[PDB]
Amino acid sequence: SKPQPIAAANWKCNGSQQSLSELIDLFNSTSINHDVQCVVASTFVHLAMTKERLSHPKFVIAAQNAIAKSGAFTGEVSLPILKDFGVNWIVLGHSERRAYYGETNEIVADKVAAAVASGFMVIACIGETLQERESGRTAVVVLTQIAAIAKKLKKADWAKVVIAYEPVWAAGTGKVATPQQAQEAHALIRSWVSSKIGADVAGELRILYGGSVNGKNARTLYQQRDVNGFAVGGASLKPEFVDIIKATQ
Amino acid sequence: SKPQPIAAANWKCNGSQQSLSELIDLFNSTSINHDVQCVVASTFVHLAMTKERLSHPKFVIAAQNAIAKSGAFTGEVSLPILKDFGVNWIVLGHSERRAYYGETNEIVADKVAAAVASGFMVIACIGETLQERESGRTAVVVLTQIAAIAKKLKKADWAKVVIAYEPVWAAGTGKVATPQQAQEAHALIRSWVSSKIGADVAGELRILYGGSVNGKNARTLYQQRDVNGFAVGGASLKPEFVDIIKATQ
């Protein structure tokens, strides 16, 4: 049986004061009857208004990135600043940061370990590109990603870790992942965790699907054996995120 | 003589809610008798708090970085988000972003042009490393950096632009810039702007000193013909920043 599901909203680099206020108001008025942890990952600029306006008992707030420590890093936000700011969840290693902003397997791993050490809950992202998948390298690429993370964690740290699998290979390329393709990837990840870190860790670990999800396909995805929720992109800026939440029943 | 001076506080990746609150209170309580534009560049997280609490009429708020466009750039903040948030000043091209976060001369130039196009006042940072200076390339590097920015600007855009010269060769290297070395760098920049953009633009341009300062040497630095103020790092998290403001009278 599954651990507690998670419905995470990755707003990415998006939003206005008005549009996210209206979104938060919808979230606040939504009845959620089952046990699910909901997460809103806003831009740094919008954390203050999200802290103030978001009140639903099943929602927490997350950052989309950080660096490990404060100092002479103009433009960046550190873990201690987020902690001082009351933000205790964080998304790390997003495919966009791996692609655009120099985050190697090892850089992601150090950020994840630093965030767990500071007391964060971490949604750590992995996932293979279209070249990697077609070339038959899905397993080695995705499991190398998570192994790099695992090499920097104690067994106890996995209690604070959530995995989001991003099927980068489908996004923007014109592909759409089937629930069986998603389940195949999640089962591969969980089997590696079971073998290399422990069956007990693997049974408790939440693995979120991070491809394109809507209110329709989310229920069918969550029915799969190794899907513990969603790390949602574009749909999390829209009212249908509510239906994605309800799909984790 | 000189155009209006600027005293900018680059807080870099630093600050708690309490410690920055106490700093803003000090700024709010400071009497500033001369014409100077003071600027507070906080982390993205602290922008809301600074907007609410900063009240001194000679102060504005700035961001430390941005990307040009909203979209699928997890972890980043865009210029439309900052503009929507009421932030109208921005530091771009800081040496730490050029070193750590992939910002080439061209990437800095594109960010500066996008910010100028969006209405921002921009503090665009240039300056050479110790290795560049020691190999005799101070002038080549500084002029290459500003030429790349100028390439993406029209003459009228310079009204929105401020240049900050960072003696990166003196940033934790063991070296210390003298006022004569700063002035030579500032004069070189002025000379290029006058010859390539216009003598009118050059006379109106603010070229800020972005190396280490205290009250005493800031007063000496402001005596130099081509220094129009300061883009301060570590002193700007301290009460001493008020003495740097005073050094521009």
Query: What residues does each domain of chain B span?
Result: 1-249
Contacts for B171-174 with beta carbons within 8 Å, 24 or more apart?
Answer: B171/A72, B171/B95, B171/B211, B171/B212, B173/B130
Q: Is A166 marked active-site? A: yes
Count other C-beta atoms under 10 Å from residue A25's C-beta: 13
Q: Does B246 touch chain A (CB under 8 A)?
A: no
Both tokens of A157, joined, read 């740290």
**CB-nearest partner of A85 from B14, B17, B74:** B17
Q: What angle do CA A82, A85, A90 make, to 5 degrees?
A: 35
Q: Are A68 and A77 in contact (CB under 8 A)?
A: no
Measuring CA to CA, which residue among A224, A209, A218 is closest to residue A242?
Answer: A218
H or E element at residue A192: helix A179-196
Q: Are B171 and B211 in contact (CB under 8 A)?
A: yes
DSSP per-residue string spanning B210-233 = -S---HHHHHHHHTSTT--EEEES
Q: Does A126 touch chain B (CB under 8 A)?
A: no
Q: Does A68 touch chain B (CB under 8 A)?
A: no
| Closest residue in A to B102 (Cα–Cα) | A101
Q: Are A200 and A243 in contact (CB under 8 A)?
A: no
| Closest residue in A to B80 (Cα–Cα) | A16
Beta bridge partners of B10: B41
Phi, psi at residue B196, to the nearest 5°?
-105, -25
Both tokens of A178, joined, read 């089937």
Phi, psi at residue B71, to the nearest 5°?
150, -155
Q: Does B96 touch chain A (CB under 8 A)?
A: yes
**C-alpha atoms less than 13 angstroms from C-alpha of B38 in its C-beta half-sphere:** 26
- One-letter amino acid for residue B113 of the chain: A
Residues across chain B: 249
| Closest residue in B to A100 (Cα–Cα) | B73
**CB-nearest partner of B73 from A17, A77, A96:** A96
| DSSP reduced 3-state for A178 | coil
Task: Report the C-alpha gap between A115 and A207 in whole angstroms.
Answer: 18
H or E element at residue A9: strand A6-10
- One-letter amino acid for residue B29 of the chain: S
Both tokens of A155, joined, read 């067994």
| DSSP reduced 3-state for A185 | helix
Count other C-beta atoms under 10 Å from residue B137's C-beta: 14
| Beta carbons within 8 Å of B128's beta carbon, 6+ residues apart | B137, B138, B141, B142, B167, B168, B169
Both tokens of B183, joined, read 């002035």
- One-letter amino acid for residue A114 of the chain: A
Task: Report the C-alpha gap between A93 and A64 in whole angstroms.
Answer: 9
| Domain A1-249 fold | TIM Barrel (3.20.20)
Measuring CA to CA, which residue among A54, A76, A81 is closest to residue A65?
Answer: A76
Q: Are A138 and A128 in contact (CB under 8 A)?
A: yes
Q: Is B34 marked active-site? A: no
Q: Which residues of B touch A94 (CB under 8 A)?
A: 74-75
| DSSP reduced 3-state for B180 | helix
Q: Which residues of B touch A91 (CB under 8 A)?
A: 74-75
